[PDB]
Design an enzyme around this catalytic site. Structure first.
Site, PDB file in Angstrom:
ATOM      1  N   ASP A   1       0.867  -1.176   0.000  1.00  0.00           N
ATOM      2  CA  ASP A   1       0.000   0.000   0.000  1.00  0.00           C
ATOM      3  C   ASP A   1       0.907   1.229   0.000  1.00  0.00           C
ATOM      4  OD1 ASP A   1      -2.241   1.593  -0.116  1.00  0.00           O
ATOM      5  OD2 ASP A   1      -3.005   1.106   1.870  1.00  0.00           O
TER       6      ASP A   1
ATOM      7  N   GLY B   1      -7.347   7.790   7.810  1.00  0.00           N
ATOM      8  CA  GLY B   1      -8.206   6.892   7.070  1.00  0.00           C
ATOM      9  C   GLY B   1      -9.666   7.254   7.243  1.00  0.00           C
ATOM     10  N   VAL B   2      -9.967   8.549   7.176  1.00  0.00           N
ATOM     11  CA  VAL B   2     -11.353   9.007   7.184  1.00  0.00           C
ATOM     12  C   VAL B   2     -11.709   9.618   5.828  1.00  0.00           C
ATOM     13  CG1 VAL B   2     -12.976  10.698   8.109  1.00  0.00           C
ATOM     14  CG2 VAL B   2     -11.601   9.326   9.649  1.00  0.00           C
TER      15      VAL B   2
ATOM     16  N   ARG C   1     -12.950  11.618   2.573  1.00  0.00           N
ATOM     17  CA  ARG C   1     -12.897  13.055   2.337  1.00  0.00           C
ATOM     18  C   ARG C   1     -14.204  13.707   2.749  1.00  0.00           C
ATOM     19  NH1 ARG C   1     -12.588  13.426  -2.951  1.00  0.00           N
ATOM     20  NH2 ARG C   1     -10.402  12.744  -2.716  1.00  0.00           N
TER      21      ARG C   1
ATOM     22  N   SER D   1      -5.011   5.266  -3.858  1.00  0.00           N
ATOM     23  CA  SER D   1      -4.699   6.651  -4.222  1.00  0.00           C
ATOM     24  C   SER D   1      -4.690   6.940  -5.719  1.00  0.00           C
ATOM     25  CB  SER D   1      -3.332   7.047  -3.678  1.00  0.00           C
ATOM     26  OG  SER D   1      -2.869   8.216  -4.343  1.00  0.00           O
ATOM     27  N   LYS D   2      -5.426   7.980  -6.108  1.00  0.00           N
ATOM     28  CA  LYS D   2      -5.551   8.351  -7.518  1.00  0.00           C
ATOM     29  C   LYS D   2      -4.288   9.036  -8.015  1.00  0.00           C
ATOM     30  CE  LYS D   2     -10.389   7.910  -7.814  1.00  0.00           C
ATOM     31  NZ  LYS D   2     -11.663   8.283  -8.524  1.00  0.00           N
ATOM     32  N   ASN D   3      -3.343   9.213  -7.094  1.00  0.00           N
ATOM     33  CA  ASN D   3      -2.092   9.902  -7.347  1.00  0.00           C
ATOM     34  C   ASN D   3      -0.893   8.967  -7.169  1.00  0.00           C
ATOM     35  OD1 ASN D   3      -3.353  12.668  -7.559  1.00  0.00           O
ATOM     36  ND2 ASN D   3      -3.897  12.216  -5.429  1.00  0.00           N
TER      37      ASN D   3
ATOM     38  N   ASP E   1       0.066   4.911   1.232  1.00  0.00           N
ATOM     39  CA  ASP E   1      -0.103   5.542   2.538  1.00  0.00           C
ATOM     40  C   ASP E   1       0.144   4.559   3.669  1.00  0.00           C
ATOM     41  OD1 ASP E   1      -0.776   7.966   1.394  1.00  0.00           O
ATOM     42  OD2 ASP E   1      -2.955   7.669   1.619  1.00  0.00           O
TER      43      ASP E   1
ATOM     44  N   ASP F   1      -0.826  -1.001   7.059  1.00  0.00           N
ATOM     45  CA  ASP F   1      -0.829  -0.384   8.386  1.00  0.00           C
ATOM     46  C   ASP F   1      -2.236  -0.324   8.989  1.00  0.00           C
ATOM     47  OD1 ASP F   1      -1.955   1.590   6.758  1.00  0.00           O
ATOM     48  OD2 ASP F   1      -1.212   3.205   8.034  1.00  0.00           O
TER      49      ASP F   1
HETATM   50 MG   LIG Z   1      -2.318   1.755   4.164  1.00  0.00          MG
END
Ligand SMILES: [Mg+2]
Length: 220
Positions: free
Chosen positions: A8, A46-47, A49, A116-118, A10, A170
Site C-alpha cells: 500500500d 483513514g477518514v 474526504r 490513491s488516484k495519485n 499511505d 498499516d
Molecule cells: Mg495503508
C-alpha cells in the site's frame, strides 16, 4: 518462497498526513472556521474526504447545501494536489528504499496496491518508479478495502497468484483485504490496532528481505 510483494502507499511507503493537513488548513482558513490544527487532523486518519469535511463543518455547526458540500470537497482535493508537488525522496519511509532494492535484486516482483488516484505520480516524485513492476488501477476496482479486490489485481498484474505474495499494510481493513485475497499479510503499527493472528512490526524499519523470508517460511 514468495514471488511477489504487494505494497500500500499511505502508511507503508510514505506518510500523507502532513499533506492532507496543509490541504484542510488551507480550506478552513478560507471559509473562516477555527480548530483545524495538527491534533484535530490526527483524528482524520483513514477518514473519507466527505466524512472529513462534515467533521470540519461541525466545528462551527455549519450547514451547507449539497452543491456547496461537493464544491468544498473538490477545492480541498485541489489544495492537496498543489501540496504534493513538494513530495520527494525524503518522504520515503525508512527501510523501504533498501527493501525495494533487495526485492529487485533477488528477482522478486514488486507491485503497488493502493487506493490513491495519485499513486504513479507520488512514486515518480519519490524516485521509486524504476523499482515497481506494476501498479493496480484503483479505477478498475469494484469494491475497496477491506475488499480483497485491489490486491488480487496487483498480484495478477505482475503475473503471480495472491497465494504467492506477501502484502504490507498499516490499517486493518487493509490487513483484512490481504487476508481475503490469499496473500500473507505483515502489518506495521501497534497491535492494539491491527489484531492477534498476524505478524506485526512497530515501524517500517523492520521490513527487510531477510525478515520477510523468515516469516514466509515460518508460515509454512
Ligand atoms: Mg495503508
Amino acid at each position: 518462497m514468495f514471488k511477489a510483494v504487494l505494497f500500500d502507499l499511505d502508511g507503508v511507503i510514505t506518510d500523507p498526513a502532513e499533506y492532507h493537513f496543509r490541504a484542510w488548513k488551507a480550506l478552513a482558513e478560507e471559509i473562516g472556521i477555527n480548530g483545524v490544527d495538527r491534533q484535530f487532523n490526527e483524528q482524520l486518519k483513514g477518514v473519507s474526504r466527505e466524512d472529513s469535511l462534515q467533521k470540519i463543518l461541525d466545528l462551527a455547526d455549519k450547514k451547507v447545501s449539497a452543491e456547496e458540500f461537493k464544491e468544498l470537497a473538490k477545492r480541498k482535493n485541489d489544495n492537496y494536489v498543489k501540496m504534493i508537488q513538494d513530495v520527494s525522496p525524503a518522504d520515503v519511509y525508512p527501510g523501504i528504499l533498501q527493501l525495494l532494492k533487495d526485492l529487485r535484486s533477488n528477482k522478486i516482483k514488486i507491485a503497488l496496491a493502493s487506493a490513491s488516484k495519485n499513486g504513479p505520480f507520488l512514486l515518480e516524485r519519490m524516485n521509486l518508479t524504476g523499482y515497481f513492476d506494476a501498479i493496480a488501477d484503483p479505477a478498475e476496482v469494484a469494491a475497496s478495502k477491506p475488499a480483497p479486490d485491489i490486491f488480487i489485481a496487483a498480484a495478477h498484474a505482475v503475473g503471480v497468484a495472491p497465494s504467492e505474495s506477501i502484502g504490507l499494510e498499516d490499517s486493518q481493513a487493509g490487513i483484512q483485504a490481504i487476508k481475503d485475497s490469499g496473500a500473507l499479510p505483515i502489518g506495521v503499527g501497534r497491535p492494539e490496532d491491527l489484531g492477534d493472528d498476524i505478524v506485526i512490526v512497530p515501524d517500517t524499519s523492520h521490513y527487510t528481505l531477510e525478515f520477510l523470508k523468515e516469516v514466509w517460511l515460518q508460515k509454512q
